[PDB]
Amino acid sequence: MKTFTAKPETVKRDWYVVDATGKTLGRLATELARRLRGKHKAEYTPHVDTGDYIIVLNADKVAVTGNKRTDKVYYHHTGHIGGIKQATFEEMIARRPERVIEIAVKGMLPKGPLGRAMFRKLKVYAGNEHNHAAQQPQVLDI
Amino acid sequence: AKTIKITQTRSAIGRLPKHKATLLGLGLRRIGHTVEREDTPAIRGMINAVSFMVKVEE
Amino acid sequence: MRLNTLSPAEGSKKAGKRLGRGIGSGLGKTGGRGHKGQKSRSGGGVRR
Amino acid sequence: ARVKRGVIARARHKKILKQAKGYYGARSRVYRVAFQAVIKAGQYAYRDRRQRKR
Amino acid sequence: MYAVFQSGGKQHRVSEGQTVRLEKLDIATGETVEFAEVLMIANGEEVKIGVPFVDGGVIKAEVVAHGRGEKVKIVKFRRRKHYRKQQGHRQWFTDVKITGISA
RNA sequence: GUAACGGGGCUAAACCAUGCACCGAAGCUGCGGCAGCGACGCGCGUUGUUGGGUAGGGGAGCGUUCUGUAAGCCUG
């Protein structure tokens, strides 16, 4: 006998909403990565993406503990010489809030075409209104 | 007699030659091997020198 | 008796050592001479 | 006896062909030995524990 | 109905009238065999969680044919050390049929 | 070019004390095969135990050309 593996056309998608207002960032990222990876299901398989579609609401109110709010600094190199640029958390929120949670969960996901396919499902919003009521995303209230 | 039982708990690679030779003088052959030996005080000396890798049960 | 059945008795024959014919024989590249040296040179060696 | 060794050599070279590989490996006699050296590792390095929950 | 049992070191799952490859036994080509060592049994809905070696569960089996499996090539190789060695192997197997499962 | 945690991130997911679980290798156990040495017996059993290996020593084989078996045998 062989072990059962999942197929691509025998996947059951689900949709959910998570509200990150007043929640810590990393601890939220861990569960987000778990759910998008699908290790929370009973038919998990490592070469197939079966995570839910999570909609994060209120991404401009992510709570960060301690002094990280002003010491946690981001880095990214453009490619040119001396082209290293940085941005503090205190200003990254005011510039592009959703990118905070986006980058924080990307590094927790795996890398490869499936790694990117998995990130394609996450949807992050700074506001609190969303036009996805057509898909009836049941709130994962915590 | 009493026939004490000895079980070898740790390996013998990279270990001091005297302990490697006492292991054979006792009778242990690999990890987890179980043997039964007399309670003579001569045996106690070997098992005392090698007491840091042999489990005893009495 | 005919010229097919006759066979020599055991131990009365044995194949000689053939050097440098593959690896599975054990007499590979070095051929038993060891690594470079006066001995390993062809015809090179000390006398009696 | 002068041995005319072509048949056995052609046989040996054909015996080691290893199709399905790309590029010179499958055409010429640039044949690695890793294809068979990793098999023994794999037969031990299967990862079939099936730990979905605990 | 489906059950489970241990024979030859491997815990297999068998269903009424099914074929499973097991280890090389010692029986003829059509001899009857019984497996009493059962770990659990279930006939839908009812799961009869079994203590080790449940008392009563029996699986009746009938051996069909015996043979050898696929050939495997073993190669162990050491670069730059003048070493190389090969081998071949084929595991022995005994196919069975399931003729009845009782509790 | 961040670059003195591998990374994300961690106010404990960090350090100290005690406690019960668990993952974890080609280690060890369960199940099948093969081979060397020893013991005990009558060529054959039943047991002990060993089987990573360079230089190197020992044993046993496959295969190619040619002489006899062969004016025999296979082959339009």
Specify the resolution in Å.
3.2
A73: Cα within 13 Å, side-chain hemisphere: 6
- Give whole-number Cα distances, C42 to C31, C35, C36, in Å: 12, 13, 11
List of residues 6+ apart from E4 with CB closer than 8 A:
E11, E12, E13, E14, E38, E39, E40, E41
List of residues 6+ apart from B52 with CB closer than 8 A:
B10
Measured from the Cβ of residue C45, the count of other Cβ atoms closer than 10 Å reads 10
Q: Does E81 touch chain C (CB under 8 A)?
A: no
Smallest CA-to-CA distance from A14 within A113, A141, A135, A142 is with A135
d(CA C8, CA A24): 91
Amino acid at D41: A
Amino acid at D21: K
d(CA C45, CA D20): 52
Q: What is the DSSP-derived secondary structure letter of residue A48? A: S
Count of domains for chain A: 1
CA angle D16, D21, D25 (to 5 degrees): 60
C44: Cα within 13 Å, side-chain hemisphere: 8
End-to-end, the C-alpha distance of chain C in Å comes to 52
Six token digits for residue C42: 């062809």
Q: Which residue is associated with the tokens 């969680």?
A: E49
Q: Which residue is associated with the tokens 């020599």?
A: C8
Q: Which residue is associated with the tokens 């495997």?
A: E72
CA of D12 to C1' of F74 (A): 27
* Contact call for E84 and C28, based on CB within 8 A: no
- Contact between D16 and D31 under an 8 Å Cβ cutoff? The reply is yes
Six token digits for residue E97: 């049929």
Structure obtained using: cryo-EM
List of residues 6+ apart from A44 with CB closer than 8 A:
A38, A50, D52
CA angle B39, B41, B43 (to 5 degrees): 70
Strands E19-22 and E10-15, sheet pairing? unpaired
Distance from CA of D52 to the nearest CA of A (A): 6
Quick one: CA dihedral E45, E49, E53, E54, positive or negative? negative
Amino acid at E93: F
Chain D residue numbers touching A3 (CB-CB < 8 A): 48, 50
d(CA B5, CA B33): 10
Amino acid at A116: R
Smallest CA-to-CA distance from E63 within E2, E8, E11 is with E8
d(CA C19, CA C25): 9
Tell me the residue length of chain A: 142
Which one of A2, A5, A44 makes the best mutation probe of the D interface by having the most chain D beta carbons within 10 Å? A44
Phi, psi angle pair for A19, to nearest 5°: -105, 110
List of residues 6+ apart from A33 with CB closer than 8 A:
A105, A108, A109
Amino acid at C48: R
| DSSP string over E3-59 | EEEEETTEEEEEESS-EEEE---S--SS-EEEE--EEEEESSS-EEEEEEEESS-EE
Ordered domains of chain B (ranges, CATH): 1-58 (3.30.1390.20)
Considering only residues 9-48 of chain B, list those whose CB is below 7 Å from strand F.
Answer: 11, 29-32
Helix (H, G, I), strand (E, B) or coil at E2: strand
Considering only residues 45-74 of chain E, list those whose CB is below 7 Å from strand F.
Answer: none
List beta partners, residue E58: E102
- Give whole-number Cα distances, A68 to A21, A73, A74, A98, in Å: 18, 8, 11, 18
Q: What is the DSSP-derived secondary structure letter of residue D1? A: -
Six token digits for residue A136: 């009836």
Smallest CA-to-CA distance from A50 within A62, A41, A59, A58 is with A41
List of residues 6+ apart from A40 with CB closer than 8 A:
A34
Smallest CA-to-CA distance from B44 within B18, B16, B22 is with B22
- Contact between A109 and A118 under an 8 Å Cβ cutoff? The reply is yes
- Supply the range of the domain harboring residue A96: 1-142
* Contact call for A42 and D52, based on CB within 8 A: yes
Amino acid at E39: L
SS (H, E, C) chain D: CCCCCCHHHHHHHHHCCCCCCCCHHHHCCCCCCHHHHHHHHHHHHCCCCCCCCC
